[PDB]
């Protein structure tokens, strides 16, 4: 209700410690917003350290933080927006519409911290995806609902391999896709955006069978960590 007021105590890189009002500590994994001259800096509560002094991780740059700067409390895990109109949007870590096709048309929001499914729920399939790529088809067939893993070194066209997969399976399949880029270069990003705009998988009026979460390596390491979490929730 009343946002718990916090005062910054220590800016020590990404770690920013806040001194929330007595007898009320925003719980671990909550989301704090500090209105800043550059948007709202989101701080994810990651420890309680005592006497209503928390130690939180920043999700945006830490320049121009003035000690004892009022910190509003959202009150809960960073909640992105989800919908079917999230498809064909570029959505940043804290759920901003960096699609640049203006504000995402939120249906529902969900937290980016969620407990993984139970053993009982998980049902193990055994059906075969096929990419038409000879090596893949013969020597390592892929399987529906799989967890395929492209282990390789530096710049083995890692992105290129993924692009080939997107070209074949994604365009072909009727299901949705989620393209998540964690610390992808903005060179690679622009190419991906353009490429999937071109292939029309992002159709600028039409429906998109993919959503985008392009995480840029310039974004703070903390923000980089929760690019993944955002993608998972979508």
């Amino acid at each position: 209700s009343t946002p718990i007021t916090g005062k910054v105590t220590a800016v020590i890189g990404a770690i920013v410690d806040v001194h929330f009002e007595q007898s009320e500590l925003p719980a671990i994994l909550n989301a704090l917003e500090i209105k800043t001259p550059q948007g709202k800096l989101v701080l994810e509560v990651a420890q309680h350290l005592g006497e209503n002094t928390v130690r939180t991780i920043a999700m945006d740059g830490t320049e121009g933080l003035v000690r004892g700067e009022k910190v509003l409390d959202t009150g809960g895990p960073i909640s992105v927006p989800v919908g079917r109109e999230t498809l064909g949007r570029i959505i940043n870590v804290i759920g901003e519409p960096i699609d640049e096709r203006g504000p995402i048309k939120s249906k529902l929001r969900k937290p980016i911290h969620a407990d993984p499914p139970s053993f009982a729920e998980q049902s193990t399939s055994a059906e075969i995806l096929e990419t038409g790529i000879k090596v893949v088809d013969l020597l390592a067939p892929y399987a529906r609902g799989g967890k395929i893993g492209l282990f390789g070194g530096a710049g083995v066209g890692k992105t290129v391999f993924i692009q080939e997969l997107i070209n074949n399976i994604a365009k072909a399949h009727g299901g949705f896709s989620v393209f998540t880029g964690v610390g992808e270069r903005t060179r690679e990003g622009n190419d991906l955006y353009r490429e999937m705009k071109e292939t029309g998988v992002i159709n600028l009026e039409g429906e998109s069978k993919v959503a985008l979460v392009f995480g840029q390596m310039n974004e703070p390491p903390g923000a980089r960590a929760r690019v993944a979490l955002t993608g998972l929730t979508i």
Binding site: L25, A27, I28, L29, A46, Q47, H48, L49, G50, R55, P77, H113, D115
Partner: protein
């Protein structure tokens, strides 16, 4: 006198050997003030229902290791001492 009475009033007056209160919780390492009757690695139940073992018994605090998820634990939490060291059904 009246001060002492008011002091008693603002004090929890917890048994505080059964009966712990989290001092600080970070990284799944709750550090509890109380639990003087604790036996090492003994099962303790938080008021979040989280269960833990007490791998570190230290003079000032007892470092419970949470078996649950950290997001459900928050400071000052009563920690009743289940009082039975980790045991599992056998049969």
């Amino acid at each position: 006198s009246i001060l002492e009475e008011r002091i008693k009033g603002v004090s929890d007056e917890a048994n505080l050997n059964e009966t712990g209160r989290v001092l600080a919780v970070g990284d799944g390492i709750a550090r509890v003030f109380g639990l003087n009757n604790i036996q090492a690695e003994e099962l303790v139940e938080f008021s979040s229902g989280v269960k833990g073992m007490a791998l570190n018994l230290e003079p000032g605090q007892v470092g419970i290791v949470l078996f649950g998820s950290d997001r459900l634990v928050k400071e000052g939490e009563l920690v009743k001492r289940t009082g039975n060291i980790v045991d599992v059904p056998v049969g």
